[PDB]
Amino acid sequence: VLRRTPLYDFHLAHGGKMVAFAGWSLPVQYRDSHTDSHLHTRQHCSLFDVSHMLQTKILGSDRVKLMESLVVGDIAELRPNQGTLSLFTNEAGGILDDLIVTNTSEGHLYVVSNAGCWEKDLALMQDKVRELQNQGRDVGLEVLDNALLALQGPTAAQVLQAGVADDLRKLPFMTSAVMEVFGVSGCRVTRCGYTGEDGVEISVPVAGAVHLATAILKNPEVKLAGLAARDSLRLEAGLCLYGNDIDEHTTPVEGSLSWTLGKRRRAAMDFPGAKVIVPQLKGRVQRRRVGLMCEGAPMRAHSPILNMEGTKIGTVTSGCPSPSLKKNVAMGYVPCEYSRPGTMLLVEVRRKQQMAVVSKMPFVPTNYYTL
Amino acid sequence: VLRRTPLYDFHLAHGGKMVAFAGWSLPVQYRDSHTDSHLHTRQHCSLFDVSHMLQTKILGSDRVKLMESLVVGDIAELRPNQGTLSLFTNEAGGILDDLIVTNTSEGHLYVVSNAGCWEKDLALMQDKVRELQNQGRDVGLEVLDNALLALQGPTAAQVLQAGVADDLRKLPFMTSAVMEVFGVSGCRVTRCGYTGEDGVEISVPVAGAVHLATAILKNPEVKLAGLAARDSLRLEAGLCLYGNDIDEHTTPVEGSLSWTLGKRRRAAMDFPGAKVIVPQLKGRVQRRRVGLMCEGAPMRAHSPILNMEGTKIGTVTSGCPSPSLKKNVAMGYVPCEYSRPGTMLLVEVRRKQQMAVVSKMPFVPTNYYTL
Ligand SMILES: CN1c2c(O)nc(N)nc2NC[C@@H]1CNc1ccc(C(=O)N[C@@H](CCC(=O)O)C(=O)O)cc1
Ligand SMILES: CN1c2c(O)nc(N)nc2NC[C@@H]1CNc1ccc(C(=O)N[C@@H](CCC(=O)O)C(=O)O)cc1
């Protein structure tokens, strides 16, 4: 029933406690508690198996045009092997999914989107490719079979450096390159992550997947990490979790992701939902995504947020205890008046009202490697 | 939100009455009644848009091995450019989806699956490719962007001959070829269908899709046909509608599809679900799919089937009036001792029993073009 990734056995052999996630079998954690796995990631580096995520290639001389007809970013402006976080929007301005798209030098776009949205996402693009060809233009879509690994943390680069002949110091955040990793040729190394720390993601061919993970794991700096730690790290980093912090009813502006909207796109008005989105850039927003902090009982998704008079003003979309801060962190939507960092709010926790404070994101300073 | 084929506007412009079908927006019928469209199809020919079905390619030298591990047919025995209907079965012998597999001379298997199952099937094959690649085998999957048109009827061949250089008399039932149809190159023409009549199916590159459709439609012999007509045409031909007549709870034996089991594989008991299927082939089976005919109001899906003793013995999976026979036809499951043609049964229709007779399928003799 549950789909397996090329590292299935690998997890079972390393104390991986499998669970159902987006129809896949993945380790929620391993031998060490997730809080320890978390802290370990922010001090050394951990290995994440994110092979369940959809990896696609947009081929054709008109690839950029196809992608920009679906996303909000300035894709054309992207330099070779340069990538960015972006969003798929609908005519209403909502978000269909968040993704990372890279303008590779192999004449193709390297797109990576959420595993829980692959059916939605693949149909969306497949349909656009057609619609585009129906208008006489060169474009193609192709799904990758490659496995996907994520090495994240301060010592992550050093570790991978041992198995690559390239100067990782020349691979800045959000750029990638095809290189042979630990013997496995044809790998895609992208300086990106979902942890807030420095790190990379290796798109490796299935045949070499286990070899790569084993090689990487041979280093004493590396420790495997499961879903649980993946989620607590990304929240501290203030990264969105599609389906929770954002969805088809939250616009890029309401979701505090305005920076993803390209400058030219803003001026062109050529992206789905632009009629709605652009006007909001002018403060015309009824709500906004913010970070919350509190003590004691942890704030959970779906919990109401009230002002200090106890009037409901919003809802929590994600929350869990922060290992790096020894407090509870969360994301939610509140009116603009209450989005200023330091704002005092109340959150219904475990049925009771709990005092919380709006925190600037990321809750923990990021360590992205930049030149 | 419904997905649209490359022929969406073409349908609207020709009077298509759009409806929701398997998540797509397709015409249920056009200007002419589904009844007249039906008959027109059996006397001349009709054009159907089936671009919503999943068209995939299995690449690699291990394609036959990958496929055989997923389907029941003898794939290795297929001569070049020869195709066959086949089934996807789980270890329990359940049918996951039915499809048509062609062993093209271009080094790849050409597969076509139901639109309503593209998520399931694609995942199924993708996962197998992954598993096989991790075993050093050379194999790959690829989804086609092509649209898919079906011209069915006694005059379809003639109508199409005017747009191709090749003698279609050389393209027997269940065989295909890559040829230039009405100016569009790269089209794969296949002598197959879902109507019981002679016919072809064209896999045409989207850019020429609308051109090919109008090109064909220009002939006075041709007339567009919608969903209702497609349903009544296949039912008369005794063909299964996955989801209705067969599903994951029906084996190829219970489904009266024993013939789809490859000749060699059947005798060797070497195919998915064999441990459940073989005993059934031998006789240890509880229910069989059959055809039923009656007068008055048409028998519909989910309607109870009973013997003359007021004992419920089965259910109707599909059903509708037959334009060609001016009677009501349907498919349903009944215990084996009640499956002999000529057997009288009672079927609940509009909250009232009606006398019905078990009929051998197809209800209307087919006219495939074979040598
Ligand atoms: C989870 N996720 C994800 C992931 O982890 N990795 C890849 N390669 N692709 C994807 N694709 C889909 C999805 C989108 N998730 C993400 C992924 C990355 C970020 C992120 O690093 N954002 C940065 C901005 C980076 C930038 O400048 O583009 C930030 O600190 O705000 C924010 C959200
Ligand atoms: C609906 N459907 C379909 C379709 O119409 N066309 C294609 N190309 N591919 C597919 N793939 C999935 C699905 C399966 N539907 C079908 C399609 C065709 C048949 C059919 O003509 N069967 C013949 C046997 C043909 C054979 O010998 O292989 C018969 O008379 O029973 C029976 C069922």
From Swiss-Prot, chains A, B:
GO cellular-component term (any): mitochondrial matrix
InterPro entries: GCS_T, GCST_C, GCV_T_N, GcvT/YgfZ/DmdA, GcvT/YgfZ_C, TrmE/GcvT_dom1
Annotated effect of mutating G238D: In GCE2; decreased aminomethyltransferase activity
Residues the record lists as binding substrate: E201, R230, Y368
Domain of life from the UniProt record: Eukaryota
Family, similarity comment: Belongs to the GcvT family.
Function: The glycine cleavage system catalyzes the degradation of glycine.
Record's disease association: Glycine encephalopathy 2: A form of glycine encephalopathy, a metabolic disorder characterized by a high concentration of glycine in the body fluids. Affected individuals typically have severe neurological symptoms, including seizure, lethargy, and muscular hypotonia soon after birth. Most of them die within the neonatal period. Atypical cases have later disease onset and less severely affected psychomotor development.
Protein name according to UniProt: Aminomethyltransferase, mitochondrial
Annotated organism of origin: Homo sapiens (Human)
